[PDB]
Amino acid sequence: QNPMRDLKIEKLVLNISVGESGDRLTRASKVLEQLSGQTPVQSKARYTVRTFGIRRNEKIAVHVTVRGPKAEEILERGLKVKEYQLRDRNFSATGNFGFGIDEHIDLGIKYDPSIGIFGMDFYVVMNRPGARVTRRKRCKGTVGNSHKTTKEDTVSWFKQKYDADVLDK
Amino acid sequence: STLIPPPSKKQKKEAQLPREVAIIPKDLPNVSIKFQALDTGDNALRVPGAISEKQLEELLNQLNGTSVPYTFSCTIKASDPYSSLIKPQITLLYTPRAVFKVKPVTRSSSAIAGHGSTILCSAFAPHTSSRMVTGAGDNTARIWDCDTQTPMHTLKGHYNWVLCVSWSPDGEVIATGSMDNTIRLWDPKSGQCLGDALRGHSKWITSLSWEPIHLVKPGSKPRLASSSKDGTIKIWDTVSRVCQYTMSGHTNSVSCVKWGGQGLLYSGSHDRTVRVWDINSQGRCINILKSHAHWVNHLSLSTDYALRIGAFDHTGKKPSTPEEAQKKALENYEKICKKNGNSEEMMVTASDDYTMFLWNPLKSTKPIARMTGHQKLVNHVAFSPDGRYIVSASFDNSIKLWDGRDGKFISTFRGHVASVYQVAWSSDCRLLVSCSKDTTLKVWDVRTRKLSVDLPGHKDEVYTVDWSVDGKRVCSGGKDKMVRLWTH
Amino acid sequence: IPDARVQPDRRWFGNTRVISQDALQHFRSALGETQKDTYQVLLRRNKLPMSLLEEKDADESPKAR
Amino acid sequence: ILAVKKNPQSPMYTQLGVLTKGTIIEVNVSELGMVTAGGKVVWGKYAQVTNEPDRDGCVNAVLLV
Amino acid sequence: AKSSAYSSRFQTPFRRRREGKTDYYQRKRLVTQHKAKYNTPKYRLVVRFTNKDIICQIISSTITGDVVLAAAYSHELPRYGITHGLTNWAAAYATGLLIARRTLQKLGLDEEAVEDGPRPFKVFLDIGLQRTTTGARVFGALKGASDGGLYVPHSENRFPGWDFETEEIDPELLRSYIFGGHVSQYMEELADDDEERFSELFKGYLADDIDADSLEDIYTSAHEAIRADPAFKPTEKKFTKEQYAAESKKYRQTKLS
Amino acid sequence: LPVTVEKPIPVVYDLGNLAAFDSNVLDKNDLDSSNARREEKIKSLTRDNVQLLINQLLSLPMKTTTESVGGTGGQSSVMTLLQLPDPTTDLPREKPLPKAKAMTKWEKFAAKKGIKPKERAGKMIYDEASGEWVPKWGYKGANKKLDDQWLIDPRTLNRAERKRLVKKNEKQQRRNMKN
Amino acid sequence: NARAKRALVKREAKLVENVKQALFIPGQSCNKNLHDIMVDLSALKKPDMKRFNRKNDIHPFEDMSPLEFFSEKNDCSLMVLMTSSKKRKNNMTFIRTFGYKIYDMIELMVADNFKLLSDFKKLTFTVGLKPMFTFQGAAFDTHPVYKQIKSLFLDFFRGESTDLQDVAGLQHVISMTIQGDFQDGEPLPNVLFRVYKLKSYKSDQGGKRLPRIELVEIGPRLDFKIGRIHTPSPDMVTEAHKKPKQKKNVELDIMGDKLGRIH
RNA sequence: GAGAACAGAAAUCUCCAGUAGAACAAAAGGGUAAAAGCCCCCUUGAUUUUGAUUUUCAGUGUGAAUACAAACCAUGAAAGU
RNA sequence: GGUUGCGGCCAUAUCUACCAGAAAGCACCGUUUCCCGUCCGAUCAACUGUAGUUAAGCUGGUAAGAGCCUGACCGAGUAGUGUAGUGGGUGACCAUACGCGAAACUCAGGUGCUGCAAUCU
């Protein structure tokens, strides 16, 4: 028994990481804006890395956070790329999961010749109602053990909701 | 900022000694005290036991068999009420002072941004102090929810500035005289105009006055007297909206008009002459008062505050019936008129002759007294609500205080650094408030003849000040375009 | 011939001398209470706004214009 | 006049306190009745001398408000 | 699991900081620091908002704890004709008015420092942890306390209708918020927009048959009732303290040998 | 209700610290832990001392102001504040007086040569070329002109000379507190 | 960052010195009741206090250096030491530093009959408030140990010095009396520290001006058995009372005129 | 640690633990930790006026430096800083 | 005796895992027109108290749990250190008495008390 709780989706975050910082980043911000319907937020380089010539505070990646019915809709578009199968190691120990794809067109964009074949990462976070007790300012607390989302729980939620195509649990 | 000189070394050496110890009276000395009243005259031979102030009051309540307080000073030995040790036989003059106590006003609540241009006039409602109207140069008046300090209704309808406001002394109608040569009656509850404007004078309206409620027959509404620069004052029937009959004869403009409680109007003018009318004899100019030697700016009656609020008091308690309203107004008006022993009320007026005359036109036609001292023109005068005191707002920065019965000089209130425009009394006759050409309001302790609190906060000069009848709010307005409400 | 310029400074549009209201009552009351002893001499005068302090009293007003 | 604040030609003249064109002087504004927020009254304020008093007789200054 | 020294090496925060209830740096500023060495006691109007209620209570900070001098809660407002909407901005104003008039009454300023006589009551708004947003109901309680005659310092900025690009308040939007103008407008264009959404969201007003345009009336009469009688009435004791304890003790778990 | 309470030896006061020092005769047999009327005795005695203290204290000179509530850092018009004297009792300071700061060789130079210390006119000086007031130093000071002026590099030469004069100033000052 | 530059300035010497912060140090032998008195007395001092929360191996009459180090690192001058032993039960050693070297020890042991805050009732009161002192017993003016303890407690609890005082804040008195008068050679009566809250009732003897005041006991009923004492060196005492140093026939007349009397 | 096209041990995104294995200019006591760290918003200053310390030849009153104070000034809803 | 708001002491209060929670309260929770803020009504702000739920927070209880705490004459006035003497020895050093003066070990106990206000089968 469960008092109407379920593994509801908080938010999925769409990362576009780039080895560099040029006009490709503005292109990626444009494609993320067009896809998610929100203005993305660029990410500053954490620390310098000479492998790809990363320099601190330079903009590596754009990402957007999206919630609610829009999140459901865009994740539904995304698994169509996966055809409702995804390997098990995607599923976190904390219940979360995500996946990646090398393209934009298949999940619903026209080619738009300036927008070439550029990549994208999904990652979806899922926690039961009552997650606010971690985020709220006053009387911040921790979510209880019987409430915390686990790997198996997201497995079952994925099974009953979309399809049953986890590969190798 | 320049400072008080610091104490010297000997000053600090003496400030550490056991000092200024209150005399902690010993129980032995006892000297006689004789009782005579300042209000009208002398009343016996008594020897009280160096007693405290309160049981002088109980001694009077026992003497006349009432058990209203009293004051107990004289010779204004230290004129002070140990309460009768060396501070005051003892020649004990007394008088009835006031029933309640108004808390001095200290904090600008906030500024309200309703009016689009300079505020020119403001009156508090007589029944309550949650209501207030201010007329400004934006052609409009506004009703202020001055307990929530927020605008209620914008009162539009004048084609030019609004120059004078008055709340009907039964608390029923608001009138707004204007730079249009037209006055308008307003619904204080709805914000809608009471029909058409009162097309009247040929020049701008300068003043407004209503009938004291103790004179109106029960069941009818008070009339309204309006003056203007054309030198004529009209009297309107506020329900039939007709100029019931005009009233003319001033060669120059009319600065102010008051509707007394003896049926006699009074009308100051720039022709150096205030003339008394009689409303009963169809407004015939029954008398002329001519002693002033330049423009006569203002007028105040000994009963004027009561005339303004006759149907109410500081409690704001509503009148049960209009006949009861009239009865209450009548017992209010005689409370400050017969108190001298007869229904004899006085009138003071201030002119640019730099001076003030005291009049008692009901019996005389020549001044009671010479009130000089000011170095520039006197802009405003108002008696204390009990009629025992007079204060003059004068340009030359100053305010002076006079004995309200014989016009004798008492003191001066210095502290303003620009010309003082208006002065509003507290309803308990203990506190003033003044507005100046400088930005500041100030309140004054009449008992100690000294400033109580300076009240800055206006960006620019302040033209209006009013003290609500329950003594809990005041208001201001001026070139700053914004209404300040101040409270304890 | 010098280069006589005056810079745009905020200091020149600010107040330089203010007098408290309480200091005004203090000095206004102290002016009357002072007495001069013939053996006291003035070494140095306080810089005071006497225009706000030397307000005497008067029994007669100026005649009108 | 209360003080000479800045003669634009040179600080030697300011020390000498000469009044020429453009010198910033401090004046006793207690007559004007300026009151600052907070209730203090301004009685000293700067003014720039706008004429050449040597060839006019008088010192004409404009107030730095 | 955590290492034995890691629990030992750790120093524990204060009890009302473990549970996120006090910002005791702000509490330090509010209680311990003074602008003047003049040893004036300083009171502290604290306003708190629960999911259902509003707590306004002036608090003197004392050597052995905080002592409440007066207190007023939103759930008292049914006494004054506001039977619903107990958390909204107008309710915050009403509660501030109530606590203001209540402490003004019980302190002797309505209806031992011998040196002067009467003296206005200055308090300081303690908000605690909720953010200082313009529009916040905590400043509604501020406005209510100030308009009630509680002489708490504040500024124009955080009242609703104060504009950033302009420099002043807009008193019309404010007066809307004192009298529930925003809720009246919402319920108007909600019954105009979607009937089901209006009905599910305002079925208290529909049951009580309170109309949108009557919110002005109920808040005005509420203010007048508050100003006439702010004195606190302890509700009623259906059961004595012993009885409540006896009923409460029997759903307890008790310590064992 | 009595307030005028006396005792044979007078009480001295230190109103600066709000203290009253009593010097009358106390008996051991009234105070020791055998006596269960101990606390009442002490409370009464200190009540008497407080009563005289407050009697003197309220009878102090006291100042009252006319400033509004929304003033700056002072008392409001309504409240009348006792004006306390300096503390009569002498108490040990916390730290020695800060006089330990010495006198430098530039000052001896400026006292031998007829040097007058400069006036503090301000940071801004008139840049006659560009018609602006540019500060002498600091944020885009008029000494950081040659660093980006558009005419080995002479700019680095100025920067090195200037930086080593800064080093010299610090070098000279750090030998002055060895004096 | 120049936050530190402000801290060094706030620490370093000033003409009009700050309020003297107190440090409450628990020694190795800090039993629970001593921590209770420390909480209560430190509360009576706050906001000018710091409480250290670990055991400290400090013996203030054998190695005085650690106290000097703590008076340096914490700007606090006044200090307190929690100690107990079979020789000295419930002992508080009250330190005073001048500069940062030691100006005073004193050794006050708490008799077992003490009472805390929690043993009493409480009224309205405000923390961080200036207390008024009473010192009974003639020996405070004269006897060296009692002069030392009087200056100790004044300097400890006087808080911030002020010249204008709000009558509302006169809310509690600190009362300190010697156990009884004595002669030379009898052993040093222990001192009685009591804290009382003021209550003023009207009394129409002197009028409205001066009320009748009666007291209510709140808080630390303490009895202090005097022990070992460190007296400052006479050079340090004569140099620790230096006035900051900030005229004949010349008087600052009222209204600020320098006047010379000519004679 | 567990995860997410590139993608590795170090690129970015996510959750969980963090309890200072963060940066407090750092001696070094304390962990200040809803900050003293990071980001954002607003914004000056070598202001003004008087007294203790200095110098004459202009000490003109602090004229000028200087000590201190007070008026301000900045910010904040406010306590305050 | 629950519960809330503000606190004092700031681990007897912490973290780790289970169970229980009547009523009220808290809370999660429902909705974005308005004030308001975000990449995102997640946080923040507002609105309803209405559509729901005690699952979580929170509070209790349990634990051969990890820590943490208290008292003791528990070491013990000892170890240690400070002061006199034909006390001494090649020496490091140690007798004898007398002021300060420990900790580990040991025994036993514990695992939140408490101030002001409001409200509760």
Residue numbers in the entry:
A (entry chain J): 6 to 174
B (entry chain x): 2 to 44, 48 to 71, 75 to 83, 87 to 91, 102 to 108, 116 to 515
C (entry chain m): 66 to 130
D (entry chain r): 197 to 261
E (entry chain D): 7 to 117, 133 to 278
F (entry chain w): 9 to 159, 174 to 201
G (entry chain v): 9 to 254, 260 to 276
Paper text:
One such enzyme is Nog2, an essential nuclear GTPase conserved between yeast and humans. A noteworthy example is the universally conserved A-site loop of rRNA helix 92 (H92), which is highly modified and contains the 2′-O-methylated guanosine (Gm2922 in yeast). We have shown that recognition of Gm2922 by the essential GTPase Nog2 couples structural maturation of the ribosome to Nog2-dependent nuclear export. We show that methylation of a single nucleotide, in the catalytic center of the large subunit, gates ribosome assembly.
To investigate the molecular defects caused by lack of G2922 modification, we genetically tagged Nog2 and immunopurified, Nog2-bound pre-60S subunits from cells expressing methyltransferase-deficient spb1-D52A, or WT SPB1 as a control. To directly visualize the consequences of unmethylated G2922, we used cryo-EM to solve the structure of an unmodified pre-60S subunit bound by Nog2 at an overall resolution of 2.9 Å. In our structure, density for Nog2 largely agrees with prior structure determinations. However, switch I and switch II (motifs G2 and G3) are apparently ordered around GDP in complex with a magnesium ion, suggesting that Nog2 has hydrolyzed GTP, as also reported in recent unpublished work. Most strikingly, the unmodified G2922 is not flipped into the active site channel of Nog2, unlike the modified Gm2922 in previously solved structures. Instead, when G2922 lacks a 2′-O-methyl group, H92 closely matches the conformation it adopts within the mature large ribosomal subunit, where Gm2922 stacks on Ψ2923. This result unambiguously shows that methylation of G2922 is critical for its engagement with the active site channel of Nog2 and suggests that Nog2-catalyzed GTP hydrolysis is triggered in the absence of Gm2922. Intriguingly, Gm2922 fills an analogous position in the active site channel of Nog2, where it potentially occludes water molecule access to the γ-phosphate of GTP. This hypothesis is supported by our observation that GDP is present in the active site of Nog2 when Gm2922 is absent, although future biochemical experiments are required to fully validate this speculation. In turn, Nog2 particles from spb1-D52A cells are enriched for nucleolar factors, including Spb1, consistent with arrest of an earlier pre-ribosomal complex.
